[PDB]
RNA sequence: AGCGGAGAGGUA
DNA sequence: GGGCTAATGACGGCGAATACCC
DNA sequence: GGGTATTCGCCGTGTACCTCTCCTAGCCC
């Protein structure tokens, strides 16, 4: 450590396990998936589908490179236009044409100039996509990997014992192919769910017949008629058999089965042909066909059983090739002849029209279509297109050697007849595969050859798949559009005479992107309320969406923890509610593979002792290892004294000797992901209160002055790194120049002429309706390094996470206060701005024209008195930093109806206040611009010039001193640079001019736009929301007086007072240690700031640091400075901060050792006096420091009421929600309420003369007003609509 | 509404496409049949057969076009129209007295109520078919237009427009004499269109999402039935959030002061016509909306015995929905009594609840006789009252209402509860002491009052001053637990009344608050203690699975009765260490009498919540002091390794994410039951 | 100028 | 750009329709 | 003849609230 932003803040932290691997980069897999995108990605999408060959034309196109243009846009300057931060992407193609009845030649080889197609939208920043001036973010999805998996199903069909089994080969984006069984012992196949069919169509229509299909599978037995030959291991367990004598010595007598000693003397007594009796071959079924040497008719066919007229004809031919299928109760299932027996389809023709009749209905079948039909499913690369997981998959699960193969599923038989070009190629380098019968085979191994099964809830099975993939499947969607279209477009063409350019269009493929990115599944509204959520939102893994479960349907097993989780995806941060288990998170130390699958870290355990070296194991590497867990004693630096150390093996802990493990854990963060790390003693706590406070961490609000946790973790210097919140050094120097919104940094001469410049952001609208801000922490002439922190945003820190203030706790019943998780509250909060938010409402108010005539932003108004028109201008616009109320006229507009105008202006949201901090004015070109838009534009460019000659200035200065530095000596390069740099800032000063200059981006239909920014200090008031970080939820209840608190012996008073009966509740003590060690921090800082009060010696406080910070880690005082001690000491007035760990955390002999360090009791609960009497009390409580936060469940958005108000077109009922004045919607349930009650007059009246009647709202409206009392019931509307929304379907409705 | 005229006959999907079919019950013929036959795919002579079109230029070749044959809807409309009913209905009724068949039977029996069921309404049998075709009124759906001169779609309008075109092209192909291959596929599809505007999602689907159409937005969630007939949005009306309020009673609840100024708004302009300081409703609006000081005086004084109606949105039983008279607070938030929370089941974490004003003359009286929080006080579901002091209150009842063994001012005699309550708070006697005090307490029979002397503590002798005379004072000398106090909740209830039974439970609240504000309970890392024999007894026990296990693995014992023996001597150790916790728990504190130690009941932070009831049970106090024993698998098997430490001492991965397992998936299971749970309420309801 | 339908997120 | 112009990751329960061994 | 034995199709799956964006579209000048 000891660098500059290090030296200012050391925390104490209780960290006894030793560190193999720093925590990674939080939000690489988007950013890398990105990288990668821009021959795999793009590239191979490209190449797929570009090969395009013509009919009658000859007219072939092949793409030779791409190449991005550069962002005319920067994505500051992109917020605010409200277009898309996108590129241009334009592809350098090259047309040849083949000239007609003639030899393969081209004509003229011309070549497109780089024709324009499409706009990606580049990522920027730290995985934000811009579209509308929203930063939106791209979720990973989480769905099942393409291959070959097996299922059975538990009670379906019949509820019998045979549990059927399912086989699924699972393409990559293509048709699907399913294999499952039946209760009626016959295998049946289905093509994209539809209606099934037996599995002999498909075999006929690969190509085979019947008696190479049934001979491949069993073994046949020689039948010479009827003495057959006497197969070795065949008889043994199985059904028995009359006596075999082998040579006149029966071993096995009449009645009784072969064993295996059985099995053993028949094998050591030479068997040959024996005389089988003729009752037991009529059981059996024909192999293939028998047919007569000399006559050649078909007397007996395959699949036949062999009655007793086939066996006389079989004799008469003499026919000694008879072969049978070997045939068992359980070993052998004869499902193929069972299969077989019911389709009488023989030939490949009427396969091929049944095929054609069950993939299209009611359509008429032909033998010239159904041959090219079959041929686009299954064996083409432009409709299939199975992957390189998918083809690993196959050969993982059906056992092939080789892993690396064909992407397209190849077959025997139907590569074998066919003679182009392509069938050529993979019938050289395969060797007969036959992957679907290779299929067959493996089910036929699960159903009775006795196999494994494997469930679909391993992450071996599921893919993450990133925006780079779904960003190619788009593309690839998109360029088979417009392959088609430049297909019928290009199909007869000429040589030059027509443009290539005029070939392709973007807008299909323009059309599908923007489709993608503006409004889908998986485009997610990112909230950037605070840098936490904004790294833990992108670093989020999801099941829902296109190819993946929906929500609404059930998923009991797909919620439920597996064992494969631990160490890829995060047990606790999971959102509870409707969707619980579905939206997962990824791991500290995990990251996504070369295929897709998750991948987390582990350590190379050697037999003798542990070696210091990372192997990233996936999930179907996992189950072979003995992988050990952390409960792994050190006697040494690398030793292992235990005899029994407690490892999984396939997600089951047991206990082995340690002469026998293989991996090992290389941190206890593995688990738990970035949001539920921050928690401090997670350990302590219980897992749901965990996952309540891991989704209570992630919705707080910054407030003004945001101050560091007590009890934090440590790493907590990273998840605010990550996010890139905070700017930081590219290269160190010294700090020439500061100010409040601009850091001026000279680069040095070691990592070197131009210098760099960092403009911090200033008070600007969040997603979330939430004020940022960069403020700086550096002074001048101060030497930095890189990778230091230079300014801290919204609620950040000198370098760690902050996210809410420390308050004093007392855990004791209040008055009735804190009755169920209520918080009680002091003044002295209130009232010295500790939980005092700004939030920033962006207001807006176009004008358009109508069939009349336009609309104008003039200020002579009617009907407008002059306690308005004073905060407007001239030009309509009210003045930049101007109080405005609620109600009051910000932006004046008119209408004209028809001297006689209507008010259209736009009026202030009731209940906010605050000033207007920004006003932003959007013209449309050839429109004359207003003194406030020539306003705008003189203070921007007067901006820019100063920025530009500033930066100009600075780096004329800083190449005067390059040249002073060498000049000293007894040089044009120097001045060289200085010209390019000024030509270039040039370049850039009229480039700012014509963006700034020119007319924005407005809606089709608009004349002038204009967006007033408020700026509102929101308070803390009774009904306000406030959470903890250990996982208290509840509300606030009231606002006492400083005076009426309790306070202890010395004088402190307590501001917030909590309720002590949750902890047995809620099972969860960590929040009580917290509070013990927030008191122990707090009394260390209390004893530090008076021992600094004092002018004292610095080697008594070096001593104390070095008594406090490495006690019984290892940190030294006397290394940085001696006036950097000072500035430690000065720094830690409020208290040094401490970290804990998630799981190797401080037992309570420490706590109890840093409580005994301080003047503070060692139980660390002391007796306090009440504030309301004076008087003592009768137990000690619990008196400390613990960390808090605000969240965004504000009162002023959810309270508020109406009586009049709008009413629909369809039925007459009021609207719903907060705007447009909705009123609160009377459930079913709250019927069935009252009618419980009876109470029938309660219940007419809040349903028919409230809301619904047309003249009962306003009968009852005008007994309330006049004084009478006399009601009027009706038919409701909505019946009235209901009766004629009936009538309108044949159906006579009257009411009689 | 508007009407269509249709050059051809198109069927009605209900009574086709539905399961009992009612043409394949008046023609006697399948639902197949029919559906190749309404969509021009076979022949229909006119006795009734499936009849393709070779059939049909065979006989057409032999008759001599004496033997007429129709396809489509002309067909099925001559064969409903020329059937006669009436002697049907008796040849049906001779095929009923043959057949004895008993599937024929019930099919015979449907037909004949069928039959008589047309016969007596009086309907034709043709009307199933259709040839003049209603469309809805233009008004009952909007054209709703967006931003930019733009228009939104619709749904039923473009099937209309299909509708039109098809019956428009259809029309001038009869008027110019098509051919008949081209008529019958417009017919075709004019049937297919018809049957998807009638029922879309039925028959093929015609959208990459279906629109709605006349049945869909009937039948199903979005339906008018359960969204416009039920349950319709009402007026004033209004959410905030929850806050508890303890210096409030339980007749009467808070209210936020806009929320009042918007809810009662025609009140205050009534009371602003009747009073004469505004001439107009918009100078009243105008003074209401400029906030003077006269504005909350007629708004405190419109609302003084008006109740309203309180109402949380997730409701489940009768008690949902209970009504209070409002009182103007501060702030933006409602506040609640917290005896009222215990029958909405509302947390404080954040929940919001709406609130009705009744308005008429009748609504108050409905909501005052019946429906106020005094006469709500047995539930629907059992006898028990459901004013039970929650968590704050009966820890406060229980810390009063004990002794110890040797306190401070104890063996002196007082005189009555006044002498009580004049040396408690000049603390010269101790909170709970064994002392000897004279009560006066009455005898129903009928007033007899009585006088006589009892030994009980100081605390209960400071509870009998709140209590009614009707009850005596043994139901209240017992330690006050939750079930003794629920036992004398309804024994005040029974046999008193209910007035004085509220002002009790008004008063009981305010002592526990009282006195739980003075007892001051805290729990810490001090009061939650470890047994001290609990590392002992693991061991032993490590010692016996290790011996298990080396007689596992030496090849004597199989795996399955292995492990069942393991979690079996691990469920033993689990209940000795839950023992020795209890014990060391309950019996820790010791104090003396004259001299000699004696034991006692111990008062420790965790001891007291979990003896006092109103928090968990036993099984979470072994949780939070010894070994949680045994974790579940989702599969249904238990873990063979066990979890030996609490939640004080630190925890492992391993551990962790063998106790997420089970913390999932009752999470997964409570959100089931509660769909589960409303599904069931729901069907049980109608 | 009032009125519509989809997709995603969050509290109870 | 412009102005009219037209999917396969749900699951359980109940009633009709051939249909197959008796 | 006949009496069930699979089999296909229809029916459904809690309540209420808060915030955000995006919709009919397309095509040859
Ligand atoms: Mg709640």
Known sequence: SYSFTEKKRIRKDFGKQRSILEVPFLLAIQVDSYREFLDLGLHAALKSVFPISSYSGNAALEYVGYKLGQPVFDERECRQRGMSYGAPLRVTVRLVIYDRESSTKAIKYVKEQEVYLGEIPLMTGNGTFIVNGTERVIVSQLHRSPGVFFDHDRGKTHSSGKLLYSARIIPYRGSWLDFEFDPKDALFTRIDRRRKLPVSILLRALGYNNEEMLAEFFEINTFHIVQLELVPERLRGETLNFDLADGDKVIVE??????????????????????????????????????????????????????????????????????????????????????????????????????????????????????????????????????????????????????????????????????????????????????????????????????????????????????????????????????????????????????????????????????????????????????????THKRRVSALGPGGLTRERAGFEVRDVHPTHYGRVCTIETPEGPNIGLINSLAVFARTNQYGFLETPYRKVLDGKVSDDVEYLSAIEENEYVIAQ?????????????????????????????????????????????????????????????????????????????????????????????????????????????????????????????????????????????????????????????????????????????????????????????????????????????????????????????????????????????????????????????????????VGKVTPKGSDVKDSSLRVPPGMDGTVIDVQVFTRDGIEKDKRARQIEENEIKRV???????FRILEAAIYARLRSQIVGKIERAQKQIQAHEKEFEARFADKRGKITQGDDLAPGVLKMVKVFLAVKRRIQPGDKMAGRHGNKGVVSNVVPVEDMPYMATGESVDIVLNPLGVPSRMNIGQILEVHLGWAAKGLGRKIQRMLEAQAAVSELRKFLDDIYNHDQRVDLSQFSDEELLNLGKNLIDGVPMATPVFDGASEAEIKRMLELADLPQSGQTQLYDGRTGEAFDRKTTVGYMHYLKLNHLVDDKMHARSTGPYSLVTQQPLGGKAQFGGQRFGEMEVWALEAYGAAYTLQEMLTVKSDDVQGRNQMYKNIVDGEHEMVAGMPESFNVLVKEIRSLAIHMELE | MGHIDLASPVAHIWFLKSLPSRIGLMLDMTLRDIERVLYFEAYVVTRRQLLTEEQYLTARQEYND??????????????????????????????????????????????????????????????????????????????????????????????????????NRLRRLLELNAPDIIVRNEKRMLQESVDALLDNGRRGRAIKRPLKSLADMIKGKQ????????????????????????????????????????????????????????????????????????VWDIL??????????????????????????????????????????????????????????????????????????????????????????????????????????????????????????????????????????????????????????????????????????????????????????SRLINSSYRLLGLKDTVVFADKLMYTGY?????????????????????????????????????????????????????????????????????????????????????????????????????????????????????????????????????????????????????????????????????????????
């Open chain 2, 223 to 294: 339906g008018r039935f359960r969204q416009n007939l039920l349950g319709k949005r009402v007026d004033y009306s209004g959410r905030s959030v929850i806050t508890v309020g303890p210096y409030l009673k339980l007749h009467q609840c808070g209210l936020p002061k806009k929320m009042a100024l918007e809810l009662f708004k025609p009140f205050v302009f009534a009371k602003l016509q009747r009073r004469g300081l505004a001439t107009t409703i918009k100078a009243a609006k105008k003074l209401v909306e400029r906030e003077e000081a006269e």
């Open chain 2, 514 to 686: 009282a006195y739980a504000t003075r007892a001051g309970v805290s729990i810490g890392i001090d009061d939650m203690l470890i047994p001290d024999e609990k590392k002992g007894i693991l061991t032993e026990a490590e010692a016996e699975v290790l011996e298990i296990q080396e007689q596992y693995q030496s090849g004597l014992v199989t795996a399955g009765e292995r492990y069942n023996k393991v979690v079996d001597i691990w469920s033993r150790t689990s209940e000795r260490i839950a023992k020795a916790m209890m014990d060391t728990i309950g019996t820790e504190k010791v104090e003396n009498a004259k001299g000699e130690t004696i034991d006692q009941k111990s008062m420790n932070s965790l001891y007291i919540m979990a003896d006092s009831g109103a928090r968990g049970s036993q099984a979470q106090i072994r949780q939070l002091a010894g070994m949680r024993g045994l974790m579940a698998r989702p599969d249904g098997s238990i873990i063979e390794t066990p979890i030996k430490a609490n939640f004080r001492e630190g925890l492992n991965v391993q551990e962790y994410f063998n106790s997420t397992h089970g913390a999932r998936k009752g999470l997964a299971d409570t959100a089931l039951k509660t769909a589960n749970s409303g599904y069931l309420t729901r069907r049980l309801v109608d």
């Open chain 1, 630 to 890: 952390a409960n792994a004693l050190t006697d040494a630096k690398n030793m292992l004294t235990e005899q029994f150390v407690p490892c999984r093996f396939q997600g089951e802990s047991l206990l082995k000797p340690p002469s026998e493990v293989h991996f090992m854990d290389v941190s206890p963060m593995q688990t738990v992901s970035v949001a539920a790390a921050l928690v401090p003693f997670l350990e302590h706590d219980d897992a749901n209160r965990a996952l309540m406070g891991a989704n209570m961490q992630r919705q707080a609000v910054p407030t003004l002055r945001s101050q560091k946790p007590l009890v934090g973790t440590g790493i907590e210097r990273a998840v605010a790194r990550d996010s890139g919140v905070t700017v930081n050094a590219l290269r160190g120097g010294v700090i020439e120049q500061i100010d409040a919104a601009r850091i001026v940094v000279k680069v040095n001469e070691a990592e070197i002429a131009g210098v760099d410049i960092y403009n911090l952001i200033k008070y600007t609208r969040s997603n979330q309706n939430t004020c940022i801000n960069q403020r700086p922490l550096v002074n001048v002439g101060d030497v930095i390094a890189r990778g230091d922190v230079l300014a801290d945003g919204p609620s950040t820190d000198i370098g760690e996470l902050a996210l809410g203030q420390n308050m004093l706790i007392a855990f004791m019943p209040w008055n009735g206060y804190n009755f169920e998780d209520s918080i009680l509250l002091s003044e002295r909060v209130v009232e010295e701005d500790r939980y005092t938010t700004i939030h920033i409402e962006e207001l807006t108010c176009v004008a358009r024209d109508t069939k009349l005539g336009p609309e104008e932003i003039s200020a002579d108004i009617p009907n407008v008195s002059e306690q308005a028109l004073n905060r407007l201008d001239e030009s309509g616009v009210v003045y930049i930093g101007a109080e405005v109320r609620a109600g009051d006229i910000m």
């Open chain 1, 254 to 535: 009449a009645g009784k089965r072969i064993t295996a000693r059985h099995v053993k003397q028949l094998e050591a007594a030479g068997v040959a042909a024996l005389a089988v009796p003729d009752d037991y071959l009529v059981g059996r079924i024909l192999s293939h066909d028998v047919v007569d040497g000399s006559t050649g008719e078909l007397l007996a066919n395959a699949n036949d059983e062999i009655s007793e007229d086939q066996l006389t004809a079989f004799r008469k031919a003499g026919v000694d090739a008879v072969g049978t299928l070997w045939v068992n109760d359980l070993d052998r299932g004869p499902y193929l002849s069972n299969t077989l027996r019911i389709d009488p389809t023989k030939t490949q023709l009427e396969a091929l029209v049944e095929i054609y009749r069950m993939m299209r209905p009611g359509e008429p079948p032909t033998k010239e279509a159904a041959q090219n039909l079959f041929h686009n499913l299954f064996f083409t690369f432009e409709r299939y297109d199975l992957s390189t997981v998918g083809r690993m998959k196959f050969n993982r699960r059906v056992g092939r050697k080789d892993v690396l193969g064909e992407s397209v599923l190849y077959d025997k038989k139907y590569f074998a007849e066919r003679n182009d070009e392509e069938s050529k190629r993979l019938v050289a380098e395969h060797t007969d595969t036959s992957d679907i019968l290779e299929v067959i085979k493996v089910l036929t191994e699960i159903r009775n050859g006795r196999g494994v099964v494997d469930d679909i809830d391993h992450l071996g099975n599921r893919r993450v798949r990133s925006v780079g993939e779904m960003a190619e499947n788009v593309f690839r969607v998109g360029l088979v559009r417009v392959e088609r279209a430049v297909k019928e477009r290009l199909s007869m063409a000429e040589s030059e005479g027509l443009t290539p350019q005029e070939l392709i269009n973007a807008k299909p493929v323009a059309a599908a992107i923007k489709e993608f990115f503006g409004s889908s599944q998986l485009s997610q509204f990112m909230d950037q309320n605070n840098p936490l959520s904004e790294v």
């Open chain 1, 945 to 951: 010039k100063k920025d530009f000659d500033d930066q």
């Open chain 2, 66 to 167: 004496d033997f007429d044959a129709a396809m489509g809807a002309e067909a099925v409309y001559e064969l409903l129209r020329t059937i006669d009913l009436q002697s049907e209905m008796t040849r049906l009724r001779e095929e009923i007295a043959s057949t004895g068949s008993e599937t024929k039977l019930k099919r015979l029996t449907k037909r004949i109520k069928l039959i008589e069921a047309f016969l007596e309404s009086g309907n034709r049998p043709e009307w199933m078919v259709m040839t003049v075709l209603p469309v809805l009124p233009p008004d009952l759906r909007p054209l709703v237009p967006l931003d930019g001169g733009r228009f939104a779609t619709s749904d039923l309008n473009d099937l209309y427009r299909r509708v039109i075109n098809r019956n």
């Open chain 2, 300 to 485: 405190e004084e419109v609302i003084r015995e008006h109740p309203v109606l309180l109402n949380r949105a997730p409701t489940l039983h009768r008690l949902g929905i209970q009504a209070f008279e409002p009182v103007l607070i501060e702030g933006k938030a409602i506040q609640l009594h917290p005896l009222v929370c215990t029958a909405f089941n509302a947390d404080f974490d954040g929940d919001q609840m709406a609130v009705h004003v009744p308005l008429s003359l009748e609504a108050q009286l409905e909501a005052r006789a019946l429906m106020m929080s005094t006469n709500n006080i047995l539930s629907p579901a059992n006898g028990e009252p459901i004013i039970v002091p929650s968590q704050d209150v009966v820890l406060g009842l229980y810390y009063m209402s004990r002794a110890l063994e040797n306190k401070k001012g104890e063996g002196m005699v007082f005189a009555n509860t006044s002498e009580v309550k004049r040396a408690y708070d000049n603390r010269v006697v101790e909170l709970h002491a064994k002392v000897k005090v004279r009560i006066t307490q009455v005898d129903v029979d009928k007033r007899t009052s009585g006088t006589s002397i009892v030994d009980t503590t100081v605390g209960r002798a400071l509870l009998s001053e709140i209590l009614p005379e009707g009850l005596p004072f043994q139901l209240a000398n017992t330690e006050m637990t939750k079930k003794n106090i």
